[PDB]
Ligand binder design. Structure first.
Ligand SMILES: *[B@@]1([O])O[C]([C]C([O])=O)[C][C][C]1[N]C(=O)[C]C1=[C][C]=[C]S1
Ligand SMILES: [Cl-]
Length: 262
């Protein structure tokens, strides 16, 4: 408890940056919190809320996920690993959700944002869930600038852990939609060096990463440990220098520290 706090503080100092952690353990309703009420730039971890907003919308529009969306050269941004393969064709909203969540595709994220009515609509959805901390201000790519002191496109680790718990394990979404979100997150391709890297190989993880300005390196996860109740873990990290390098190792270390001895 105090041991874990000290270990997180030592990791943070060694890292040179600012670390935010929230773990919810659904075994006993306990938490581990470190700067859990401070704001951090979400960066690509915000893609979970945008996909969830589309899933919510689909509850009253049962054919929504099949809807076709044109991909054009004008849609391309800075990071288009899936979308660049589909220029001059269409992708379904399901495909765009999967591309955003599993490959962190920024065009896909922009199409999800646009569909549901823009960043203020994704934010209003967060409010409807009871999350009064989340704010999505901008589209891709600018939502990742992560300037220190800038509250745009931020949330707290506590808020995001509670919200992710509600989305993946609770009743924010209908059963089909929740299952789809969990399926997409379990199939993520981008997370193996982050939270997953600090957990035993046998544990099952659905996570969403993000990388941004000021070396901002983030991951949010739902975790099914071997023969245990699930966990929700948010690890946010950001650094003082604009061109700081990614530090996914810091997220792995934080994950190890807060799950040790479970
Ligand atoms: B996102 O924050 O994270 C992605 C990688 C990941 O999931 O680990 C890549 C796309 C996103 N980040 C960016 O677009 C990078 C920046 C844009 C403006 C400043 S940094
Ligand atoms: Cl192992």
């Amino acid at each position: 408890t105090a041991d874990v706090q000290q270990k997180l503080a030592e990791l943070e100092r060694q890292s040179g940056g600012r670390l935010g952690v929230a773990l919810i353990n659904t075994a006993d309703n306990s938490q581990i919190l470190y700067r859990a009420d401070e704001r951090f730039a979400m960066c690509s971890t915000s893609k979970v809320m945008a996909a969830a907003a589309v899933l919510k919308k689909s509850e009253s529009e049962p054919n929504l996920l099949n809807q076709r969306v044109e991909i054009k050269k004008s849609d391309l941004v800075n990071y288009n690993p899936i979308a660049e393969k589909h220029v001059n064709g269409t992708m379904s909203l399901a495909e765009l959700s999967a591309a955003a969540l599993q490959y962190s595709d920024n065009v896909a994220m922009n199409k999800l944002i646009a569909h549901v009515g823009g960043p203020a609509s994704v934010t209003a959805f967060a409010r409807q869930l009871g999350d009064e901390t989340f704010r999505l201000d901008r589209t891709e790519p600018t939502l990742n600038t992560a300037i220190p002191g800038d509250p745009r496109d931020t949330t707290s680790p506590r808020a995001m852990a509670q919200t992710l718990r509600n989305l993946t394990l609770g009743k924010a979404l209908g059963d089909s939609q929740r299952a789809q979100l969990v399926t997409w997150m379990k199939g993520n391709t981008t997370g193996a060096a982050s939270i997953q890297a600090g957990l035993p190989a046998s544990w099952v993880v659905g996570d969403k990463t993000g990388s941004g300005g000021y070396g901002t390196t983030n991951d949010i996860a739902v975790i099914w440990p071997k023969d245990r109740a699930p966990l929700i873990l948010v690890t946010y990290f950001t650094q003082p220098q604009p061109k700081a390098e990614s530090r996914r190792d810091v997220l792995a270390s934080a994950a190890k520290i807060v799950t040790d001895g479970l």
